[PDB]
Amino acid sequence: KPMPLTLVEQILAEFQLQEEDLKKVMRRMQKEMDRGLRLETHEEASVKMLPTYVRSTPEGSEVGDFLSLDLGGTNFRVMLVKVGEGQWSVKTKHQMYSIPEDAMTGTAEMLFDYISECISDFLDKHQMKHKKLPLGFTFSFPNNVVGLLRDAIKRRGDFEMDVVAMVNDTVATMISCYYEDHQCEVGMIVGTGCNACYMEEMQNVELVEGDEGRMCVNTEWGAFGDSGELDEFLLEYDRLVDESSANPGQQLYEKLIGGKYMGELVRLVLLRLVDENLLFHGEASEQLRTRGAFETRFVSQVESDTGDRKQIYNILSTLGLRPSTTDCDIVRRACESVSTRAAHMCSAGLAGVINRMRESRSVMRITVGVDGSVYKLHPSFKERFHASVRRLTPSCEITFIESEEGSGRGAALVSAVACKKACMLGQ
Ligand SMILES: O=C(Nc1nccs1)[C@H](CC1CCCCC1)n1cnc2ccc(F)cc2c1=O
Ligand SMILES: OC[C@H]1O[C@H](O)[C@H](O)[C@@H](O)[C@@H]1O
């Protein structure tokens, strides 16, 4: 690597977070998680620590047979599932259906009429119209669906079917990863938003009576920062993003991490560098000066550049810029600075959860299931994230996994849990 321009590095170094900074954040997050779990303070807590009712012990045992409906981009899978017996066997049969142009381009109602017709055909094929099966949705993308399907089934009026509430995406991640690795007790998403769930000791889940076993808690930790917990770490860019957001003052933690805001943060950093005459010869394009024009996907593409600067040039050319080679290199480092800080901030949260779990259970081996566009698509984000988390979690051995599509059985397990939960809750 070349000797970087000192004045650029001074600006980009603003994003640095030292171990002590992350430990401070981690401790603050842990106090907010405490606040969310306790009966006395839950109502006012910003980090809600929602009980998911997904317990460490099997429940809804009367749910044996169910449907799982996996929504892809332009097709879907209907799957009939039987969960049986000491670890669960997940027995399946399924069918892929292509969504025709007709059904994909009309109203959501018409689309779900078509989906319902396919379910009907599927149940006819497998001679299952004698049962009112529960159905859970899963998503495998490269108005809400529960309601649309519920309405469409009512519309048909020929077979009865319950559509169960979906679990949170973090919970779905944990469950699907658990299918592959039974030490998975944490689910996390780093996509457009950022969130985590984990298996909390029932004694600490004060919102649900009982001290036996564990229950998954959905932290909804994106809301962290409400009372200034992150203020000392906020940069001018963060303040601007927040001020122009739909919910100023809220979701400040998520605003530091999520793909919703990452590109915009980079844009503002680039404009700062332009204003200081360190980038594009002090001349920004009209596109560069337009809110939202630097898409988060551009950040990942810039960091994917192989060294020839062609990926970076193509992004910047699209923005009406004619970057020099130095301009391209600076943009890469600006992207790296923002994404690294996101990884650092995210690691403080997960570290807080993991260290809490270790002390609640009193060295800990644990698997963390992770999904989301940023974690998956962003070059080296997961690697930087992993390294930081591990640095903050001494005496824990953390394995990170991503759900493998496989034969859809991980997704089937998500639906099993969703259906069993709905049964347990009297829905
Ligand atoms: O289904 C469960 N709990 C429910 N609560 C309410 C309705 S169903 C838990 C969930 C898992 C999730 C991952 C962490 C450990 C508990 N679960 C899931 N899948 C399993 C598969 C094999 C096995 F031997 C046990 C379980 C199990 O307890
Ligand atoms: O998509 C990841 C996360 O985004 C937001 O934080 C949502 O509030 C949360 O429910 C979800 O888990």
Side-chain angles (χ1 to χ4, degrees), residues 1-84 86-427:
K1 295 184 316 185
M3 174 191 268
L5 291 167
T6 295
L7 285 184
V8 171
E9 295 309 280
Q10 283 173 28
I11 293 170
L12 296 184
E14 286 178 298
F15 284 85
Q16 289 181 350
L17 294 170
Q18 311 286 67
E19 184 174 1
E20 79 198 324
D21 301 320
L22 299 182
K23 283 176 160 178
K24 190 168 199 184
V25 169
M26 184 184 73
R27 286 189 292 269
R28 289 171 168 180
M29 177 69 85
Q30 289 179 136
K31 282 108 215 79
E32 294 312 318
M33 292 195 298
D34 254 278
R35 199 185 317 281
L37 284 168
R38 284 168 47 248
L39 274 170
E40 261 182 7
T41 55
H42 172 84
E43 187 179 6
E44 56 262 54
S46 72
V47 178
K48 288 297 181 187
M49 307 296 284
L50 297 176
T52 63
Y53 296 99
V54 176
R55 297 169 185 271
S56 53
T57 56
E59 229 68 64
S61 62
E62 59 266 46
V63 183
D65 281 27
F66 63 94
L67 273 339
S68 194
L69 174 59
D70 192 63
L71 261 40
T74 59
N75 48 222
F76 61 97
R77 187 179 55 208
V78 183
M79 180 175 49
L80 227 209
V81 187
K82 321 91 214 309
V83 169
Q87 244 46 234
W88 293 357
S89 59
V90 181
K91 187 179 304 198
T92 68
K93 63 199 81 211
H94 45 259
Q95 181 61 241
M96 288 302 303
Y97 294 92
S98 184
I99 303 162
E101 280 177 326
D102 209 320
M104 228 167 89
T105 59
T107 61
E109 281 74 16
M110 285 165 58
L111 172 51
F112 277 77
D113 289 341
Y114 179 77
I115 289 162
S116 296
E117 175 168 28
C118 291
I119 294 164
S120 180
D121 287 350
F122 183 82
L123 295 169
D124 290 342
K125 176 175 188 153
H126 298 295
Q127 303 212 325
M128 290 297 297
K129 290 286 188 69
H130 59 109
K131 283 196 183 165
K132 177 180 63 62
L133 296 165
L135 177 150
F137 276 94
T138 61
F139 297 150
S140 68
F141 305 129
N143 280 347
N144 55 78
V145 298
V146 166
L148 292 161
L149 187 57
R150 197 169 282 162
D151 287 343
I153 288 154
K154 260 170 147 157
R155 221 166 283 131
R156 261 206 153 239
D158 66 324
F159 74 90
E160 216 141 287
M161 201 190 81
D162 286 323
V163 183
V164 302
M166 295 185 66
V167 298
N168 186 256
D169 55 2
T170 62
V171 177
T173 299
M174 185 186 64
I175 293 165
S176 58
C177 288
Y178 175 89
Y179 179 78
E180 308 290 352
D181 184 348
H182 302 143
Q183 281 203 282
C184 184
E185 297 188 74
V186 180
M188 183 168 41
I189 301 288
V190 194
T192 300
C194 180
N195 188 24
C197 65
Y198 73 100
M199 297 304 295
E200 180 55 272
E201 306 299 296
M202 271 298 293
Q203 55 259 51
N204 298 334
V205 186
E206 295 193 358
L207 269 60
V208 184
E209 189 166 68
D211 303 324
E212 209 80 302
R214 297 187 186 126
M215 181 184 286
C216 184
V217 167
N218 173 10
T219 65
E220 291 289 341
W221 70 18
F224 180 64
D226 246 20
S227 43
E229 299 95 330
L230 294 165
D231 279 7
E232 85 169 81
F233 305 111
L234 300 183
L235 301 177
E236 60 191 51
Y237 321 108
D238 302 304
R239 297 183 188 285
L240 291 170
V241 165
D242 181 49
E243 298 319 72
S244 288
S245 70
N247 57 349
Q250 303 179 260
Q251 305 299 114
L252 296 182
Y253 187 53
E254 194 164 54
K255 287 162 168 173
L256 296 171
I257 298 163
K260 187 165 171 65
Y261 315 94
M262 192 180 287
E264 181 65 7
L265 287 167
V266 175
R267 194 182 69 85
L268 297 173
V269 170
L270 301 191
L271 291 181
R272 162 79 177 277
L273 295 170
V274 169
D275 197 51
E276 309 259 344
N277 228 115
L278 301 170
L279 195 61
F280 311 135
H281 298 155
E283 284 271 51
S285 64
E286 294 188 344
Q287 277 173 97
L288 191 63
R289 266 135 152 66
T290 303
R291 255 192 95 254
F294 205 101
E295 305 185 339
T296 291
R297 63 164 59 73
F298 299 172
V299 186
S300 55
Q301 175 165 344
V302 158
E303 286 182 59
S304 296
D305 192 271
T306 194
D308 63 19
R309 308 171 175 97
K310 276 277 187 147
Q311 290 293 285
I312 303 159
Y313 193 91
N314 289 6
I315 293 265
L316 298 172
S317 68
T318 306
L319 292 165
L321 300 157
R322 289 125 217 171
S324 63
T325 51
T326 307
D327 288 333
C328 289
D329 295 342
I330 292 159
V331 169
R332 197 194 217 282
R333 295 211 303 285
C335 287
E336 285 170 9
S337 297
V338 172
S339 61
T340 291
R341 195 198 47 174
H344 278 146
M345 277 298 184
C346 198
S347 73
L350 178 61
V353 170
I354 290 173
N355 291 332
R356 161 181 253 286
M357 293 172 83
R358 185 195 153 253
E359 80 173 74
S360 294
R361 306 167 180 209
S362 47
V363 32
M364 184 183 69
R365 273 196 303 152
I366 192 166
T367 293
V368 178
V370 196
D371 200 352
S373 53
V374 178
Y375 180 87
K376 277 182 169 176
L377 304 177
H378 201 98
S380 79
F381 177 93
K382 72 175 60 53
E383 284 81 4
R384 286 172 276 162
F385 172 65
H386 294 162
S388 192
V389 171
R390 290 188 167 120
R391 185 155 41 260
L392 298 166
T393 53
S395 85
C396 302
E397 216 196 315
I398 309 163
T399 300
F400 296 90
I401 61 175
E402 296 165 45
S403 321
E404 303 91 28
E405 170 57 31
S407 296
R409 295 181 208 278
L413 188 63
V414 174
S415 289
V417 173
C419 290
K420 285 170 175 282
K421 174 188 165 174
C423 179
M424 187 184 73
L425 295 173
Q427 295 166 352

